[model samples]
Target: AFGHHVQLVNREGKAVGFIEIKESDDEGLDIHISANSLRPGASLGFHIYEKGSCVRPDFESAGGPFNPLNKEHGFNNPMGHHAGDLPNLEVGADGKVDVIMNAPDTSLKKGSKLNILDEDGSAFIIHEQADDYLTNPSGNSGARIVCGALLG
Candidate 1:
């Protein structure tokens, strides 16, 4: 019965979308994402991070990857991938997007291996470009344009 809402913003700090995540009866996570004012025909990617800090002291910091198990990035990687890896969100010609997805490996329960609600907390991010599905450490996806802390 756990649920949360995430607001997505662009690089210019403009609101672009909203994501809703809820725990399902089957013990999986149900995710729904809606986007407006996004680039038409573009693909957006997302990932969950172990740390939720929106900024860092380092001027050149690109932010840390969210792999708690330190797994390699990419869904197509033969070596294995992080639990946070997800499919890309595609925008339509109307400059809007709507997607429903399932995260079978993640949970809202405490102490679960894929639990997103952890001590260090977690962050949900939207990338500017599509994930290549084979690149290590991030699918060579472009910069992160939106970030929201996932709370319990």
Candidate 2:
């Protein structure tokens, strides 16, 4: 059985970021995240959460550099990043950010230990400030960032 209770942690093994898989559809996994526990202006990136949508309607829809909600053609076009892309984790003055998002197709299970494929495999990354998801590997999220995979 697959479940969603993934958590994001810091260097000290503390829970800093969190993602909860709430619903699943043919499209992918619907998730909710909170980075408020992390630094006030931290950034995060991963291979799984490729697509994202912010539930905070007030937030300026930031994904593609395009004017409206546009989709990326996977390295085909110069401008990338879509609504499914998780934004840079921004912690509030109180030290936390609350967001509702969704992830694209993935095999990540709730209680299964993750087997990152490479030395720089799929990792939860935290950036110094914000990020530009259209970029590669680091996405300008700043630094390799902090990270943790879903553990059994």
Candidate 3:
């Protein structure tokens, strides 16, 4: 498989940017994005939700974090994290994010463990706050600020 892409938009249906996920040799993923129009100088959080659809205005349609393995959420969870968990996204002073994060538990290839293109594909969501990395269900990342549906 080549990769996956998504178009990020805010709750108001305003465009933010794009997120790209590419396959890596280690069965991991390289998540890169060039997002703007976010809160300045904030260390925001984002995740891979189960559904592949992004509902406008609220984005609750994307559903919860991907947990087909029946695990908890948060990257620092001692019990292990959901396949959806990711590191905090540091927004620049210009209200932009142009960095890449690694997803060591994911793959772009079909049938792979934690494959990005699962039965429902997946979705990405930006949070209004930093992830606590220890909360249940989610990272206590607060409200959903932006969202997008994964397209591989």
Candidate 4:
């Protein structure tokens, strides 16, 4: 089994970005995401899912295209919005973005598997676009960028 470790770095190669898990309460989980090597005018969105398959060590099945006007199906559908679908994270001119979201009703307790598809677990994902959070959910964001599994 692989263990989790934290290191400060300026690059991730294909890794794209990084996520920092902080503290939380009964309300939800708190997180901080840092990104690099992104194109200009790139918007970002973040989500939490009930399946480990949603977010993984290699960013597999991390959710949908984060295009603001794309469509609502992949990971933005409100009905499709699992416990993982979080607010859209906006990237600035510096190609750097910091976001904080309240992952609702996540089941990331100790020994719990990080799987959004699971009937009872959750994962976190970052999209490469902006989310309306009102009008369109799927289309509201862009491409998938960064993600990670959370545990308590």
Candidate 5:
């Protein structure tokens, strides 16, 4: 599949940024991000959640990380991180983020480990703080600040 995009909306229903996804053959996916209205020079955490809705004000409706394998959290952990454990978003001095990252475990292909278009779908969530990359759950990333359904 192509053009799987997400509009990351803040708690007040304001759109802050977007994520554009493109499949890279069988080598997972390529992700492009462009966002603004953020704390300049701040490091914010983000993840792909198991659910698809951003209906709740606090984003609790998004559920947990998209950990289909039920693995431990954190990239630095020996047990391995969740499939949704993306790196922290680094805001520039202009309060904007424009970068490209890879999701080697994800794809639009059915029966994949990180399929974004599963029956229940998926969501992307932003956190108030940066991920420690070692915390047991959620990498200690505080407060869900924004979220968007991955279905679109």
Candidate 6:
């Protein structure tokens, strides 16, 4: 599976970045993100949602956390964490961001629960601020400024 030049759009519906995902040989996914312009020195949280579209009223109902296992939301939590709880993506002072990530818990193969290519599809979301790392549902990371749908 591959996503080619999937544009990332902000709340104003402006293109701010591009993302590409390819299935690695090891059953994981290789994610690449190029931000043309984003909040400088900001910590961006990455989350995968069960829904591909962000047209819903809230982030949770739209797609929410990709918690197939129903674990809590957080990487620093003492309890189990969700598969979608990834590390923060930091934006540099240049107003541009480049990041390469590996989603070991996710898969590209069909029928896999962690597969992003599901019927409802999935999405990669970028939050406006840093995650507090200990919230129940969401990390109190504020609004989602960038969204990239991962279509099947």
Top TM-score hit = 5
- Worst 10-residue lDDT window, candidate 1: 54-63
Candidate 5 lDDT over 33-110, as tens digits, reads 788888899999888889888975899886888888798888998897798899899999998989988877777888
- lDDT per prediction? 0.72, 0.44, 0.82, 0.47, 0.84, 0.76
For model 3, give the RMSD to the true fold: 1.7
- Looking at model 6, residue 39 earns an lDDT score of 80
lDDT value, candidate 6, whole model: 0.76
- lDDT measured at residue 7 in model 4 versus the true structure, 0 to 100: 23
Better of 1 and 6 by lDDT: 6
Expressed as tens digits, the lDDT of each residue in 1-152 for candidate 6 is 55645777766767778889888876578889887567888787777877777552234435768888888888788875878777788989987788888877788688888887787777778887888788877688887767877776
Using lDDT as the measure, what is the rank order of every candidate, best first? 5, 3, 6, 1, 4, 2
What TM-score would every model get versus the actual structure? 0.84, 0.53, 0.92, 0.55, 0.92, 0.88
Residues 17-124 of candidate 2 have per-residue lDDT tens digits of 675654456444555666545565444443332212221221112122211234452232376644334545556777776776554433344432222222222333
Instruction: Specify the poorest-scoring 10-residue window by lDDT in model 6.
Output: 54-63
Q: Which stretches of candidate 4 lie over 4 Å from their true place?
A: 1-13, 53-81, 110-123, 134-137, 140-142, 149-152
**Highest lDDT, which number?**
5
**lDDT digits (tens) for residues 83-142 of candidate 1:** 788888788999888888876667878977778877766677767789988887778877
Candidate 3 backbone clash number:
0
